[PDB]
Each structure stands twice: as structure tokens, then as C-alpha cells.
Amino acid sequence: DGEIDIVALGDSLTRGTGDESGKGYIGYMVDELRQQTDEPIRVTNLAIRGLRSDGLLRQLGQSEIQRQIAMADLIVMTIGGNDLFQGALEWNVKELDEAKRQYIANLDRIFALLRRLNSEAVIFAIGLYNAASDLDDAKRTSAIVRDWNFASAEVAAHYPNIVAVPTFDLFALHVNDYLYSDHFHPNKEGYKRIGERVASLITLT
């Protein structure tokens, strides 16, 4: 094809919501990839802001979407944040356990479907951060976020070339310096740190 095809999937973090410019972490990733080669780099961003893990699995069932997954030389995605923060974190442990169980089951089926459509392309599964790390309930939110990130990477470890990229430590110090006005989504600087971390994991040869 003579072209580097990047397919982006998932929720608002992959759409770039909260970034002053429209770049998001994808744009800063492409900026770094263009230091390595003059080969054209094309991005197909299929992210939807309010997407959950069950919607992403259903989205990956569309024939046109599957045709673009099979052409991908590289897959980057963020999913599960909407599974966890559906309405402010739910203070019910029974609802939280069920939401995590559905999310892990959907995530495993998402990874399997992506690998059936594309056995070669590296999948970068980007983890979650704690935006409410400056509130009184920050301790409970850090524990739940880190618990979900662990289960994410455990699911990714069951498939070849699926890299769980963490972002938790990128927002550990002075979190509001890297957050949007909603204190939930990242800002321009927060997405830049995510995109530069993902790009440094990509080496074209």
C-alpha cells in the first residue's frame, strides 16, 4: 500500500475531547512518527465520545468497520472509562462489580475480534488515570482506577502484541495542570503527554 494506516478506536479520550486544538493524543503521536519516515501516515479515527465497551464490540461488527481494521498497520484505543464513570463515581459496590465484570468480558471479546480481523497489527490499549485525585474521595477513586487498569492489562496479556499503555502516572503530580475545565477530560498538555508516551513505544524500520 505504501502507506502507514493507523486505526483509532474507543471513547472521548481517543476522540480528543478536552484538547484546545483538535489534535488529541493521536495528533502528537503522528507528529513523532513523522520524525522517523517520510512514508505517508493516515489516521482513521472511529472513536465515539460516549462509547462503552459493549458499544465498541457492537461497532466492530459492522462490515465497513471490519474492512478498515484489517487494513490497519497499527491500532490504538481507549475503552472502559465510560463503563466506569456512567453517571461522579457510583458508591455502590454491587453495581461496580457488575460493571467491571461486563467490561472485562467485553474487552476480551474485543481483543479476540480485533485479532481475528488483523493478526499482525500491534494494538496499543491505553489505560486510565485518576482525574478526581484532588477531591476528598480521591483515595477510593485511585484504588478503583488502578484495579480496573490491572484487569485491563491482564486481559491484554492473553493476546500477542497487545500493549497495555499506562497513563496513571502522567497525571499523578498536579493533576489539574493537565485537565480540561470539566476536571475529567485531559487538556492540550495532558493529551500531549499521552501521545508522546505512545509514540516512543513505536519504532518503524
mmCIF file of C-alpha atoms in Angstrom:
data_model
loop_
_atom_site.group_PDB
_atom_site.id
_atom_site.type_symbol
_atom_site.label_atom_id
_atom_site.label_comp_id
_atom_site.label_asym_id
_atom_site.label_seq_id
_atom_site.Cartn_x
_atom_site.Cartn_y
_atom_site.Cartn_z
ATOM 1 C CA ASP A 1 0.000 0.000 0.000
ATOM 2 C CA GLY A 2 2.997 2.274 0.537
ATOM 3 C CA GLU A 3 1.236 3.932 3.465
ATOM 4 C CA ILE A 4 1.074 3.627 7.256
ATOM 5 C CA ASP A 5 -2.556 3.090 8.290
ATOM 6 C CA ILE A 6 -3.389 3.876 11.927
ATOM 7 C CA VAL A 7 -6.889 2.959 13.123
ATOM 8 C CA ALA A 8 -8.061 4.625 16.338
ATOM 9 C CA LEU A 9 -10.963 3.241 18.375
ATOM 10 C CA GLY A 10 -12.782 3.905 21.631
ATOM 11 C CA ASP A 11 -14.284 6.791 23.591
ATOM 12 C CA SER A 12 -13.699 10.535 24.102
ATOM 13 C CA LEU A 13 -10.024 10.126 25.033
ATOM 14 C CA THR A 14 -9.335 8.853 21.510
ATOM 15 C CA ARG A 15 -11.639 11.491 20.013
ATOM 16 C CA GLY A 16 -9.574 14.150 21.795
ATOM 17 C CA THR A 17 -12.327 15.723 23.903
ATOM 18 C CA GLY A 18 -10.879 18.437 26.134
ATOM 19 C CA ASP A 19 -7.957 19.347 23.868
ATOM 20 C CA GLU A 20 -7.844 23.031 22.915
ATOM 21 C CA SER A 21 -6.783 22.074 19.404
ATOM 22 C CA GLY A 22 -8.350 19.125 17.645
ATOM 23 C CA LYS A 23 -5.147 17.095 17.907
ATOM 24 C CA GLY A 24 -5.696 14.832 20.901
ATOM 25 C CA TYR A 25 -3.077 12.251 21.773
ATOM 26 C CA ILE A 26 -3.344 10.846 18.227
ATOM 27 C CA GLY A 27 -2.003 14.031 16.650
ATOM 28 C CA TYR A 28 1.052 14.225 18.898
ATOM 29 C CA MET A 29 1.656 10.541 18.166
ATOM 30 C CA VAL A 30 1.666 11.222 14.415
ATOM 31 C CA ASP A 31 3.981 14.213 14.893
ATOM 32 C CA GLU A 32 6.581 11.926 16.471
ATOM 33 C CA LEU A 33 6.069 9.167 13.893
ATOM 34 C CA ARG A 34 6.792 11.686 11.123
ATOM 35 C CA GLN A 35 10.288 12.158 12.564
ATOM 36 C CA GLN A 36 11.057 8.541 11.606
ATOM 37 C CA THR A 37 9.940 8.338 7.964
ATOM 38 C CA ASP A 38 8.550 10.300 5.031
ATOM 39 C CA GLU A 39 6.104 7.485 4.257
ATOM 40 C CA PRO A 40 2.524 8.852 4.320
ATOM 41 C CA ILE A 41 0.780 8.288 7.656
ATOM 42 C CA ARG A 42 -3.020 8.102 7.524
ATOM 43 C CA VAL A 43 -5.260 8.094 10.606
ATOM 44 C CA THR A 44 -8.740 6.548 10.638
ATOM 45 C CA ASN A 45 -10.340 7.719 13.894
ATOM 46 C CA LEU A 46 -13.527 5.759 14.636
ATOM 47 C CA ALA A 47 -13.856 6.941 18.243
ATOM 48 C CA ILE A 48 -17.223 7.993 19.671
ATOM 49 C CA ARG A 49 -17.318 10.142 22.806
ATOM 50 C CA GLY A 50 -19.965 8.223 24.746
ATOM 51 C CA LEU A 51 -18.786 4.781 23.668
ATOM 52 C CA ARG A 52 -18.711 1.946 26.207
ATOM 53 C CA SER A 53 -17.097 -1.474 25.880
ATOM 54 C CA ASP A 54 -20.377 -3.058 24.750
ATOM 55 C CA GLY A 55 -20.890 -0.413 22.069
ATOM 56 C CA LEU A 56 -17.336 -0.827 20.789
ATOM 57 C CA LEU A 57 -17.859 -4.585 20.479
ATOM 58 C CA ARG A 58 -21.086 -3.925 18.567
ATOM 59 C CA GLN A 59 -19.345 -1.288 16.437
ATOM 60 C CA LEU A 60 -16.654 -3.815 15.470
ATOM 61 C CA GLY A 61 -19.456 -5.934 13.976
ATOM 62 C CA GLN A 62 -20.056 -3.554 11.072
ATOM 63 C CA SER A 63 -18.656 -4.800 7.772
ATOM 64 C CA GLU A 64 -17.202 -1.430 6.745
ATOM 65 C CA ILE A 65 -15.559 -1.049 10.164
ATOM 66 C CA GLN A 66 -14.084 -4.549 9.888
ATOM 67 C CA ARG A 67 -12.678 -3.726 6.444
ATOM 68 C CA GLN A 68 -10.751 -0.808 7.955
ATOM 69 C CA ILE A 69 -9.495 -2.860 10.915
ATOM 70 C CA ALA A 70 -7.997 -5.458 8.560
ATOM 71 C CA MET A 71 -6.091 -2.741 6.669
ATOM 72 C CA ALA A 72 -4.581 -1.281 9.849
ATOM 73 C CA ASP A 73 -0.821 -1.347 10.336
ATOM 74 C CA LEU A 74 -1.352 -0.043 13.888
ATOM 75 C CA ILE A 75 -4.312 0.064 16.286
ATOM 76 C CA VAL A 76 -4.686 2.493 19.206
ATOM 77 C CA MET A 77 -7.679 2.560 21.530
ATOM 78 C CA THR A 78 -9.137 3.746 24.836
ATOM 79 C CA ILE A 79 -12.227 1.984 26.189
ATOM 80 C CA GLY A 80 -13.740 1.421 29.629
ATOM 81 C CA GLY A 81 -13.783 4.951 31.039
ATOM 82 C CA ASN A 82 -17.462 5.254 30.154
ATOM 83 C CA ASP A 83 -18.040 1.796 31.647
ATOM 84 C CA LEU A 84 -16.637 3.042 34.978
ATOM 85 C CA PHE A 85 -17.982 6.630 35.034
ATOM 86 C CA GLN A 86 -21.520 6.212 33.716
ATOM 87 C CA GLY A 87 -23.223 8.988 35.696
ATOM 88 C CA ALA A 88 -19.023 11.174 39.860
ATOM 89 C CA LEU A 89 -18.270 7.536 40.697
ATOM 90 C CA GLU A 90 -21.045 5.186 41.797
ATOM 91 C CA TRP A 91 -20.842 4.495 45.534
ATOM 92 C CA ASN A 92 -22.383 1.009 45.161
ATOM 93 C CA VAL A 93 -20.017 -1.964 45.283
ATOM 94 C CA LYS A 94 -22.527 -4.378 43.726
ATOM 95 C CA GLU A 95 -23.071 -2.135 40.696
ATOM 96 C CA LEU A 96 -19.313 -1.549 40.467
ATOM 97 C CA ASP A 97 -18.503 -5.272 40.464
ATOM 98 C CA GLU A 98 -21.085 -5.958 37.749
ATOM 99 C CA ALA A 99 -19.860 -3.082 35.573
ATOM 100 C CA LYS A 100 -16.283 -4.378 35.804
ATOM 101 C CA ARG A 101 -17.389 -7.935 35.013
ATOM 102 C CA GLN A 102 -19.268 -6.794 31.899
ATOM 103 C CA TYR A 103 -16.333 -4.606 30.872
ATOM 104 C CA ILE A 104 -13.741 -7.384 31.200
ATOM 105 C CA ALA A 105 -15.952 -9.811 29.275
ATOM 106 C CA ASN A 106 -16.498 -7.261 26.501
ATOM 107 C CA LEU A 107 -12.815 -6.276 26.414
ATOM 108 C CA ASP A 108 -11.719 -9.893 25.969
ATOM 109 C CA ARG A 109 -14.177 -10.317 23.091
ATOM 110 C CA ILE A 110 -12.970 -7.033 21.574
ATOM 111 C CA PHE A 111 -9.332 -8.159 21.635
ATOM 112 C CA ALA A 112 -10.255 -11.536 20.138
ATOM 113 C CA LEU A 113 -12.301 -9.955 17.342
ATOM 114 C CA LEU A 114 -9.535 -7.470 16.508
ATOM 115 C CA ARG A 115 -7.002 -10.307 16.314
ATOM 116 C CA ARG A 116 -9.261 -12.331 14.007
ATOM 117 C CA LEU A 117 -9.573 -9.300 11.716
ATOM 118 C CA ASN A 118 -5.878 -8.345 11.966
ATOM 119 C CA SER A 119 -3.365 -10.860 13.315
ATOM 120 C CA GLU A 120 -0.271 -8.693 12.734
ATOM 121 C CA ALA A 121 -1.022 -5.100 13.759
ATOM 122 C CA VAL A 122 0.171 -4.077 17.218
ATOM 123 C CA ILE A 123 -2.726 -2.983 19.441
ATOM 124 C CA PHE A 124 -1.996 -0.177 21.912
ATOM 125 C CA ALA A 125 -4.543 -0.395 24.744
ATOM 126 C CA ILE A 126 -4.232 2.868 26.674
ATOM 127 C CA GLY A 127 -5.151 2.759 30.358
ATOM 128 C CA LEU A 128 -6.966 5.192 32.624
ATOM 129 C CA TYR A 129 -5.903 7.960 35.006
ATOM 130 C CA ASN A 130 -7.430 9.457 38.155
ATOM 131 C CA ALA A 131 -8.834 12.903 37.378
ATOM 132 C CA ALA A 132 -10.541 13.272 40.791
ATOM 133 C CA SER A 133 -7.202 12.841 42.609
ATOM 134 C CA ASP A 134 -7.666 16.232 44.328
ATOM 135 C CA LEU A 135 -11.056 15.577 45.972
ATOM 136 C CA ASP A 136 -11.886 14.076 49.360
ATOM 137 C CA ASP A 137 -12.870 10.779 47.691
ATOM 138 C CA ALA A 138 -9.569 10.673 45.777
ATOM 139 C CA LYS A 139 -8.274 7.620 47.653
ATOM 140 C CA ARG A 140 -11.270 5.477 46.684
ATOM 141 C CA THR A 141 -11.081 6.627 43.057
ATOM 142 C CA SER A 142 -7.362 5.857 42.735
ATOM 143 C CA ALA A 143 -7.913 2.333 44.067
ATOM 144 C CA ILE A 144 -10.807 1.620 41.697
ATOM 145 C CA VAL A 145 -8.994 3.074 38.672
ATOM 146 C CA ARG A 146 -5.837 1.084 39.425
ATOM 147 C CA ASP A 147 -7.963 -2.039 39.948
ATOM 148 C CA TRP A 148 -9.553 -1.681 36.501
ATOM 149 C CA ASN A 149 -6.188 -0.960 34.862
ATOM 150 C CA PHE A 150 -4.820 -4.196 36.334
ATOM 151 C CA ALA A 151 -7.710 -6.215 34.891
ATOM 152 C CA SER A 152 -7.246 -4.436 31.544
ATOM 153 C CA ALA A 153 -3.595 -5.454 31.249
ATOM 154 C CA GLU A 154 -4.398 -8.978 32.440
ATOM 155 C CA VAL A 155 -6.820 -9.352 29.524
ATOM 156 C CA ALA A 156 -4.235 -7.866 27.154
ATOM 157 C CA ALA A 157 -1.652 -10.407 28.353
ATOM 158 C CA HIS A 158 -3.792 -13.207 26.859
ATOM 159 C CA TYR A 159 -3.182 -11.973 23.295
ATOM 160 C CA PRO A 160 0.040 -11.402 21.339
ATOM 161 C CA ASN A 161 1.229 -7.867 20.568
ATOM 162 C CA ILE A 162 -1.407 -6.083 22.659
ATOM 163 C CA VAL A 163 0.408 -3.480 24.761
ATOM 164 C CA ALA A 164 -1.359 -2.000 27.785
ATOM 165 C CA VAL A 165 -0.069 1.587 27.838
ATOM 166 C CA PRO A 166 -0.479 3.213 31.278
ATOM 167 C CA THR A 167 -1.363 6.860 31.806
ATOM 168 C CA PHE A 168 -1.923 6.883 35.584
ATOM 169 C CA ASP A 169 1.496 8.299 36.481
ATOM 170 C CA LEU A 170 1.176 11.006 33.808
ATOM 171 C CA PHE A 171 -1.496 12.681 35.979
ATOM 172 C CA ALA A 172 -0.079 11.870 39.426
ATOM 173 C CA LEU A 173 1.518 15.262 40.166
ATOM 174 C CA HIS A 174 -0.561 18.460 39.919
ATOM 175 C CA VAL A 175 -3.360 16.713 38.064
ATOM 176 C CA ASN A 176 -5.385 19.856 37.330
ATOM 177 C CA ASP A 177 -2.482 21.246 35.287
ATOM 178 C CA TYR A 178 -3.319 18.531 32.720
ATOM 179 C CA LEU A 179 -7.136 18.529 32.914
ATOM 180 C CA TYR A 180 -9.871 20.283 30.957
ATOM 181 C CA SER A 181 -12.364 22.662 32.581
ATOM 182 C CA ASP A 182 -14.605 19.669 33.365
ATOM 183 C CA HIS A 183 -11.864 18.286 35.672
ATOM 184 C CA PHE A 184 -12.423 14.934 33.944
ATOM 185 C CA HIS A 185 -11.047 15.073 30.400
ATOM 186 C CA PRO A 186 -7.411 15.981 29.704
ATOM 187 C CA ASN A 187 -6.378 19.327 28.290
ATOM 188 C CA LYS A 188 -3.911 20.041 25.486
ATOM 189 C CA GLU A 189 -0.919 19.340 27.732
ATOM 190 C CA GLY A 190 -2.423 16.128 29.105
ATOM 191 C CA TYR A 191 -3.054 14.687 25.645
ATOM 192 C CA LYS A 192 0.470 15.678 24.584
ATOM 193 C CA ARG A 193 1.978 13.578 27.381
ATOM 194 C CA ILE A 194 -0.212 10.609 26.431
ATOM 195 C CA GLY A 195 0.623 10.914 22.735
ATOM 196 C CA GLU A 196 4.365 11.246 23.294
ATOM 197 C CA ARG A 197 4.369 8.177 25.556
ATOM 198 C CA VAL A 198 2.567 6.053 22.955
ATOM 199 C CA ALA A 199 4.806 7.339 20.157
ATOM 200 C CA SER A 200 8.010 6.393 21.996
ATOM 201 C CA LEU A 201 6.749 2.783 22.005
ATOM 202 C CA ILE A 202 6.510 2.799 18.184
ATOM 203 C CA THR A 203 9.666 2.187 16.139
ATOM 204 C CA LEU A 204 9.330 1.978 12.359
ATOM 205 C CA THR A 205 12.015 0.103 10.429
#
